[PDB]
Design a protein around this nucleic acid. Structure first.
Length: 1168
DNA sequence: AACATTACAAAA
């Protein structure tokens, strides 16, 4: 019967096989993480292990060592739960093959020549590994006996609706004909598995829970592999990325690994493609109607209450601010009425709004759309005003509704956590165990059950969660469609689709949740945010949790690779050629193809079926290809050629194939070498005769082979190598390693042709909304990294919302260096997946589309870990000298300066708008004071900021820079640094700080408050918006406050009714009338109207009655007269004036206080 | 007037 853990008692856990340098790399990198950080902290380790070097062997050996560590810990600690281990990759085939190789490694591992594990130990180790396929394949791999046992054991054998479905599926199973039956069988398998597992979980949740043991337990574990994980029988899981993201079922519920990642280990193969896989999963979420959701939340949170039992302790306080916000919002926007549209152009096309939620907002409407409540009609109408009214906009309403909805979801997450805490306290059982019960209890107390599904999905994508850091990767985007409701022509809905995080945010969340992640890929650290994770963001967010290899470790890996791929010492030569298009060569070949035709254009248009418009394009990619083939046929020693194109040569282009075939035959006859061709070698072809035919032909026939495939067809685990027959091959082969004829003798592709990859922007074919979200995510990621300026990104977003074509999106993308990095990544993967063996020809021919040369000449990374073919390509490209290109870092600096300035401008405008809205909030006052305090304390910072990163920009100079833009105009038109040699300059001298602090009163105040008296010469300096609108005002306010306090004045906090209208209130000698103060840092024109000042004064007196008003200037010339003004800002006598103006408190020539002005102010107060 | 495609996973 099943092997037990008591069979490892005499096993020695210190005896290990001789470790390869890669194993040392992994272990040495991971040990310093446990030293520097703790044992409970996660890590992210990207390992650039290229294919053929033994990366799968290394990963599986690491996994086996983790298994042995778990067994040793269990023996020593004789009940801690098992540490979960996951092997994740994109493809199902790679998962199955990796599990097979792990089992083989367990079976056939030897130490010092003796077998490492006994039969019982081998069986026990194999019992801990489980594979989690999709539900259809899970059902179809279970025998009828197992399913009958499961149905009998759970009393489902008499339900009719269950037995009919199972009988139908069994009948389909016993009649497995051509795949026409198989598609239907798979669909019904999925549906039946869903229904059966739902019923089983419902039965197990209730009181009449079936006891599982013996044969029933075995059958259930066969049907539900996750039950093995839940019980503790297994702790190693092989699964795909999508399966990992969705989760798997056990007898209780659906287990989500993302919610239980503390302590787990992930081995992610081909990590850089998981970015695209995760994005595709994220873009499939369900859209929400915001009007319905907000109306439901407002209606149900008005009255319904939670129970006051100890299980709900301090949970009700989590929801009170949401209730107040909902009630205020519903009062403001009149949610008692339904919504509709009226006007021209609002009916033919629905309204589309896009928001990045911070500073990028785009609308499909040509004119701003307004929102007005008609009380006579009892309606909320969306208008188009053909004539700025801040209140009453559709964008404001949509943004606030989205904020409230996300707030509700986050509060539900917090309440679930609190409920788990309380339940742990009482019944003394994990977070994943009480999650569903908590959600159900909370939603049924509030009568909000219809949000159930939504909440679950939220906890999937935001239950994985240093706060005021701003980044697209953890805020996301929102796409809203306003359109008429279905079936009714007088109401509208606002369907919103969200991306609450990017794939990089998901990865950072997993690392911060305590998971240790090993990402294995040769292009793991590529410089693309489209085809890879954003590693700048990951670095910023993780710090030392993002591990890396030292120079010595990299050199060890390089030495190992060179020792296993010694080319130079074994006489292997890589010949690289760049092929330009040749019109005369193709013309001659075409004329020979059809000698009776008049011109080659006639043959192209009529015989090959090429439309006249596309002929030129076909004349470029054909001739080049043909040229390569010719150079392959005239080569004597070469046998195997792979041609990587962008389009497959299936029967759809059959005519073209014939032409190529003709040419091949001719060239064969010209060079007396047999040549076989394999057209249309794609994935469906491999599902049929499966690339074994090419290997057999190379093994049994003495001719050349040319294979026509694409980049997409050559996956990670395709392995295009053949068995060598030394009779057919001459003496050309060379062994480049030191292994003693390891097992079979295999060779690889010998000649390769590479085309320039084309469709390098991702797309989603799941639905129109998923594709829209994918495109918007790509634009926003490019803006976040700095590849795009905010103006270019906003224009691109506007075009995407208008609905442009893919060609225009590709043209937009081609202007970025991210595009070149993606091209080079594709080339590197292509040349790396073709050197998987150790037997090499005398000459290896690389033929490259010439359009790649200018790209490949721009490679600048360390070639310490590049493959030999890639190094040869780069050297051949660079052999043409150097070309003048724009530095990526400098352009990114300019773009990021513009981005930070624009974000700061829009954020400051929104904050000021929220402040001038009575009644104000308290978080807004806190944010305003925190911004001012941070700028005062740290005008410049040395390290990259974390909490206030958008208040600063990185300048090429230290402590100062130049700019030219209108701070009250368009944020997209700002220019920075050397682009504006003569422009407004931001530094310590332009703010007159040094002269200000020289005064005897302000300086002690600055010291006791901690404010900087000078600017450190640093690279991070505040953006122009904060320098002009925040920093100078703070300097003036602090100087005035210090000067007045030194003269025995008292200050109190301004209340929210008049906030930001006046900085402080003056209290002196107990004058019972209120005194109001407003300061300007230096002499500047009063752009605010005198009527505006009168409006402010009248508004203030409307709440506080008569009072005194002071307008003071902190710094200036102290010889100017002291003015008295009336409510209309007209000069009046001191016996009737209400406004007192102080031109300067400290002189700008000697930093001397205007004590005469202070004495006159004191006398004025005594005259009141 | 730009650019010029295939491939996959979990299903409900």
């Amino acid at each position: 019967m099943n092997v037990s853990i008591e069979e490892f008692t005499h096993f020695d856990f210190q005896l290990v096989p001789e470790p390869s340098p890669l194993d040392l790399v992994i272990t040495e990198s991971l040990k310093n993480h446990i030293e520097v950080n703790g044992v409970k902290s996660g890590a992210l380790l990207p390992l650039p292990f290229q294919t053929g070097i033994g990366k799968t062997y290394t990963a599986l050996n690491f996994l086996l060592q983790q298994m042995l560590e778990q067994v040793r810990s269990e023996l020593k600690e004789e009940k801690k739960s098992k540490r979960l281990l996951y092997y994740v990759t994109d493809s199902v085939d790679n998962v199955v093959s990796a599990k097979a190789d792990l089992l083989k490694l367990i079976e056939k591992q030897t130490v010092k020549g003796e077998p490492r594990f006994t039969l019982e130990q081998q069986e026990y180790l194999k019992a801990q590994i489980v594979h989690l396929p999709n539900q259809s394949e899970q059902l179809l791999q279970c025998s009828d006996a197992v399913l009958n046992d499961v149905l009998i054991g759970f009393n489902l054998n008499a339900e009719r609706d269950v037995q009919a479905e199972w009988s139908a599926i069994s009948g389909l199973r016993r009649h497995a004909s051509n795949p026409e039956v198989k598609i239907s069988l798979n669909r019904q398998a999925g549906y039946f598995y869903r229904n059966l597992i739902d019923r089983l979980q419902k039965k197990q949740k209730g009181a009449d829970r079936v006891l599982l043991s013996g044969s029933l337990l075995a059958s259930v574990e066969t049907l539900l592999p996750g039950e093995k994980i839940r019980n503790g029988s297994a702790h190693v899981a092989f699964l795909t990325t999508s399966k990992f993201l969705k989760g798997f079922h056990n007898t209780r519920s659906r287990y989500s690994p993302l919610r239980d990642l503390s302590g787990a280990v992930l081995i992610i193969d081909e990590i850089d493609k998981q970015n695209q896989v995760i994005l595709s999963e994220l873009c499939k979420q369900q859209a929400q109607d915001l009007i319905w959701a907000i109306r439901t939340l407002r209606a149900n949170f008005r009255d319904h209450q939670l129970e006051s039992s100890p299980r709900y302790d301090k949970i009700e306080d989590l929801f009170e601010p949401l209730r107040e916000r909902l009630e205020e919002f519903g009062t403001n926007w009149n949610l008692a009425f339904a919504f509709n549209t009226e006007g021209a152009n609002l009916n033919e096309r629905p309204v589309r709004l896009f928001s990045d939620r911070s500073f990028t907002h785009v609308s499909s409407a040509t004119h701003k759309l307004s929102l007005k409540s008609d009380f006579l009609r009892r309606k909320n109408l969306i208008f188009s005003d053909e004539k700025i009214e801040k209140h009453g906009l559709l964008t404001r309403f949509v943004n606030e509704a989205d904020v409230i909805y996300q707030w509700f979801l986050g509060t539900m997450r917090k309440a679930v956590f609190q409920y788990w805490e309380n339940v742990r306290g009482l019944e003394i059982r994990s977070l994943e165990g009480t999650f569903q019960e908590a959600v159900q209890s909370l939603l049924t107390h509030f009568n909000l059950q219809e949000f159930e599904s939504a909440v679950y999905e939220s906890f999937d994508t935001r239950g994985l969660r240093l706060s005021s850091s701003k980044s697209y990767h953890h805020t996301g985007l929102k796409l809203v469609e306003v359109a008429h409701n279905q079936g009714t022509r007088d109401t509208v809905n606002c369907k919103a689709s969200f991306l609450n995080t990017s794939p990089s945010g998901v990865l950072a969340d997993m690392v911060d949740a305590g998971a240790v992640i090993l990402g294995i890929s040769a292009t793991a650290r590529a410089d693309t945010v489209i085809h890879n994770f954003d590693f700048k963001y990951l670095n910023e967010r993780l710090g030392n949790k993002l591990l890396s290899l030292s120079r010595e470790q990299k050199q060890r890996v390089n030495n190992y690779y060179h020792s296993r791929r010694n080319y130079k010492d074994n006489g292997v030569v890589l010949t690289v050629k760049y092929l330009n298009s040749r019109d005369a060569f193709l013309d001659a070949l075409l004329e020979e193809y059809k000698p009776e035709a008049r011109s080659s254009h006639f043959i192209l248009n009529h015989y090959l079926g090429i439309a006249e418009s596309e002929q030129a394009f076909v004349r470029s990619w054909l001739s080049k290809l043909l040229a390569s083939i010719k150079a392959f046929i005239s080569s004597p020693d070469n046998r195997y050629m792979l041609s990587l194109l962008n389009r497959t040569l299936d029967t759809t282009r059959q005519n073209i194939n014939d032409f190529i075939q003709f040419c091949c035959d001719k060239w064969a006859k010209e060079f007396n070498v047999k040549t076989k061709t394999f057209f249309g070698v794609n994935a469906d072809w491999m599902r049929l005769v499966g690339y074994d035919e090419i290997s057999k032909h190379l093994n049994t026939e003495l001719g050349k082979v040319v294979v026509f495939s694409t980049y997409a067809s050559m996956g990670a685990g395709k392995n295009p190598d053949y068995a060598v027959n030394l009779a057919l091959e001459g003496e050309s082969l060379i062994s480049v390693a030191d292994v003693t004829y390891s097992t079979q003798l295999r060779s690889d592709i010998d000649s390769i042709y590479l085309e320039k990859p084309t469709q390098l922007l991702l797309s989603d074919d799941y639905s129109h909304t998923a594709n829209q979200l994918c495109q918007f995510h790509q634009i926003l990621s490019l803006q976040e990294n700095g590849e795009l300026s905010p103006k270019s990104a906003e224009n691109w977003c506007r075009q995407q919302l208008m609905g442009m074509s893919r060609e225009r999106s590709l043209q937009q993308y081609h202007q970025t260096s991210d595009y070149q990095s993606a091209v080079r990544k594709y080339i590197e993967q292509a040349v790396g997946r073709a050197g998987r063996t150790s037997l090499k020809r005398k000459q290896i021919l690389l033929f490259v589309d010439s359009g790649l040369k200018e790209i490949l000449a721009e490679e600048s990374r360390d070639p310490s870990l590049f493959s030999h073919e890639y190094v040869a390509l780069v050297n051949k490209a660079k052999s043409a000298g150097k070309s003048i290109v724009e530095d990526r870092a400098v352009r990114r600096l300019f773009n990021l300066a513009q981005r930070n300035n624009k974000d700061g401008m829009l954020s400051i405008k929104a904050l000021v708008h929220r402040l001038h809205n009575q009644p104000a909030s308290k978080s807004d006052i806190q944010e305003w004071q925190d911004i001012r305090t941070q700028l005062l304390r740290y005008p410049t910072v040395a390290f990259q900021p974390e909490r206030f990163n958008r208040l600063y920009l990185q300048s090429m100079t230290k402590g100062y820079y130049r700019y030219q833009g209108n701070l009250d105009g368009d944020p997209n038109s700002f220019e920075f640094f050397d682009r504006v040699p003569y422009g407004d300059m931001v530094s310590e001298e332009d703010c007159s700080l040094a002269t200000l602090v020289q005064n005897q009163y302000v300086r002690p105040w600055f010291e006791r408050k901690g404010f900087a008296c000078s600017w450190q010469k640093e690279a991070n300096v505040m953006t122009p918006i904060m320098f002009t609108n925040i920093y100078k005002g703070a300097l003036g306010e602090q100087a005035v406050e210090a000067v007045l306090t030194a003269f025995d004045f008292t200050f109190e906090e301004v209340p929210n009714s008049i906030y930001e209208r006046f900085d402080n209130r003056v209290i002196f000698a107990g004058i019972e009338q209120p005194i109001w103060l407003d300061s300007k840092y230096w002499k500047h024109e009063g752009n605010e109207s005198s009527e505006g000042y009168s409006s402010k004064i009248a508004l203030v007196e409307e709440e506080f009655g008569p009072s005194k008003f002071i307008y003071v200037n902190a710094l200036g010339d102290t010889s100017k007269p002291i003015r008295y003004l009336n409510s209309c800002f007209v000069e009046t006598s001191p016996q009737l004036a209400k406004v007192i103006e102080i031109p300067a408190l400290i002189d700008d020539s000697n930093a001397d206080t205007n004590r005469t002005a202070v004495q006159e102010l004191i006398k004025w107060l005594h005259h009141s």
